[PDB]
Every structure is written in structure tokens, then in C-alpha cells.
């Protein structure tokens, strides 16, 4: 709620980024192989921005990616319902 | 609400576009470096259209980008709940 679904998104975005590099390293060609841009990629994913920078190529990397989508889009189906509520409320007054 | 969450999106989309060019200029390779296409890029971002044209490469450019996503997706989680309400209502009559 208040800042709860928020925190869960950040667990996802970290552990996601961390595991993406683990799964993708070893696949010849993967760009998703350093902890920085891995993190950026998990934001590119939770928010469905689909910029086209990074994406996974391994099976497990794609599973990790799907977990981020779900756990992100849901978080962000709620973080965005809450920033809308709080500031729109106080700012609407 | 009526046209309130709307206006906030436009503050975001401008100041976003303006800062993107500031952060990205100086990074060898960035395409996000003129105030026009910067603006278009912030729409590409607030609306999660992910066309793949522009995207940032600097750290700060990506932060700016994330601010647009949040403040945009939230605005557009409300601008789109309001155009749905007004015209669907009057048009539904």
C-alpha cells in the first residue's frame, strides 16, 4: 500500500538484476552481463518501456525476465495507483 | 483530476526532455542530444510505447528516464482514466 508494494518492487528489481547476470553469463553473445545495466534492464522490464537496449537470450534469463514483469507490473500496477492517490489527493486540494 | 494530472504530465515531459539533453550530452555516442527528439523520447517513455528510437546511455540520463516513467505512467494512469470517464460518459449518453 502506502510504501509497501513499493518495497517489494525493489526486492524484485535487485534480485532480478542479480540473477540475470548469473543466468546470462555463459551464453555466447549476451549483453546482459554486468550488474549495472542488468539493473537498468529490470526497470526496462517492470515498467513495460521496451526500449530495446538489453534483453536475455538464455532460457533461465527469460524466466528471470518473466518474474520481473509479473512482480514488477503488479508492483507498478500498485505503485502507480498510489502515487496517483497521494499526490493527486494532496495536490488536488 | 479534470485537467490536473494532465498538467503535471506536461511539466514532467518538458523538464524531462530538457534534462535528458543535459545529462546525455558529453557521453560519446548518445542520440538523445537535441531538445526536439528529447521531447519525443519522453513521450515514448511516459506512454510505454518502447518504439526503440531514442534511449539514454548515461547513468543520469537513465535516472531522468525513470522519473519520466513513474511521473508519466502515473499521470497517464490518470489522464487515461479521465478521458475514459469524460468522453465515454458524454459520448455514452
Amino acid at each position, epitope marked *: 500500500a502506502a510504501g509497501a508494494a513499493t518495497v517489494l518492487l525493489v526486492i524484485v528489481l535487485l534480485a532480478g538484476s*542479480y540473477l540475470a*547476470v*548469473l543466468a*546470462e*553469463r*555463459g*551464453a*555466447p*553473445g*549476451a*549483453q546482459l*552481463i*554486468t*550488474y*549495472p545495466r542488468a539493473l537498468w534492464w529490470s526497470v526496462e522490464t517492470a515498467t513495460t518501456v521496451g526500449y530495446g537496449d538489453l534483453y536475455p537470450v538464455t532460457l533461465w534469463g527469460r524466466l528471470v525476465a518473466v518474474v520481473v514483469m509479473v512482480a514488477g507490473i503488479t508492483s507498478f500496477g500498485l505503485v502507480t495507483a498510489a502515487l496517483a492517490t497521494w499526490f493527486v489527493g494532496r495536490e488536488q486540494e | 483530476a479534470a485537467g490536473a494530472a494532465t498538467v503535471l504530465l506536461v511539466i514532467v515531459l518538458l523538464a524531462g526532455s530538457y534534462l535528458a539533453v543535459l545529462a546525455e550530452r558529453g*557521453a*560519446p*555516442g548518445a542520440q538523445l542530444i537535441t531538445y526536439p527528439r528529447a521531447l519525443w523520447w519522453s513521450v515514448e517513455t511516459a506512454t510505454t510505447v518502447g518504439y526503440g528510437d531514442l534511449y539514454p*546511455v548515461t547513468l543520469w540520463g537513465r535516472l531522468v528516464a525513470v522519473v519520466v516513467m513513474v511521473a508519466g505512467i502515473t499521470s497517464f494512469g490518470l489522464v487515461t482514466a479521465a478521458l475514459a470517464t469524460w468522453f465515454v460518459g458524454r459520448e455514452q449518453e
Partner: antibody
Amino acid sequence: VQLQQPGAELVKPGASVKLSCKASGYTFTSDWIHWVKQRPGHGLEWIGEIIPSYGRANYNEKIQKKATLTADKSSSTAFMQLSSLTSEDSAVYYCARERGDGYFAVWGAGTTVTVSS
Amino acid sequence: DILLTQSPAILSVSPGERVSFSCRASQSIGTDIHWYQQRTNGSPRLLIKYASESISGIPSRFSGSGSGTDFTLSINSVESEDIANYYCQQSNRWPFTFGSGTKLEI
């Protein structure tokens, strides 16, 4: 001395050998340990990486996969086992500490391996 | 397996004059290049990271240039202590790769 590896080894041809890399300093969860091969008067051949904390290793696709990587999660020492060597396998062997950002911040002194009877 | 190609192989130069080793990749890698110096008998030593960023504890002579596929290690001046092999190494796509190496002769 950050990364620390022994000076020199000698291997009978066809036999095996283990290589050490005790690393004082930090021991981050996110650390990776790499191994680079330098044949005499050659460049740097990346052999393979290992993340000691979690435990997975990845070897060089393109070379004869002669080795396998291991670690000691609470001795801060990582290992590389080279099995059944020839004289093509005699070289200097560095270990490196990539932080997870994609460069070899820290280099061991290198272990010189000579495969002779 | 991204191919880094360091030309020229050897580099003649008079002391104090600017020198530039070119690295050139087999496809775009953005800025994920890093330069390593390695003198005789010694281990390699990180010089420039991410193609432009300096390393603390590195002389200001070493200047990182380049982006995309054309990369340029540069030394604004030269002195005798700079004789070594020099290596570029990309971290943009797995596996990490190295260049062929460039030696500096004075």
C-alpha cells in the same frame, strides 16, 4: 598484495594440477574471479570466470575445455584444475577480480606453469 | 566472440610526443572497452575503464577516447617509464575478449 597466487608449478605431461588464488581485501558477494592465460610471447587468453559466493563457473567456448573452476566460500581462495596437460599448456596464469562491472580491477602476480618430464 | 583488433602492432615515437593506439571492434560495443598496460615480467594493470574514464592512481598522460567500434588509448606526452604491451578488452557481450596487443618503442 590483493590477489595472491603461487610462483611456479611443474607438471608431468598428461598429469593434472590445481592452481590457487587467495584474495585478501574485500570478498563481495557479487565478486567474480577470472583466469587469463599468457603463453610466452603471446597476448591474453581469457579462460573462464567463477563467482565464488554463489558457485557457478563459465569456461571459454573456443578453447579445448581442459580445466574446471572451484572456490572456497570461507577461505577466500579460488581454484582452477587443469587436467592432462601438453606442452601447449605451459604458460603464465593470472587470476583477476572483476567487480561485476566488466573490467579486471585487480590482478594476481601470475603462476608460471612448465609441463615437462 | 567479439574481435578486438589493435593496429598497429608496434609503435615508434620520440619522447614527450603524443601517441595513440587504436582498438577496433568487429561490431558496436558502445563504450565497454578497457585498456591494460603490462610491462615486461609484470602482470597487467588497468589503465582506462569504459573507454574514457580514468583510474585513480594512473598518470594524467593516459587519455581515454573512442566509442562504438573505434577506440583510442592516448598518451598526452611520452616518457621512458611507459614502455610496455597495451591491451584493449571488451565487456559488452559474452565472452569478454582481449585485443592482440600493442608494444610501444621509443
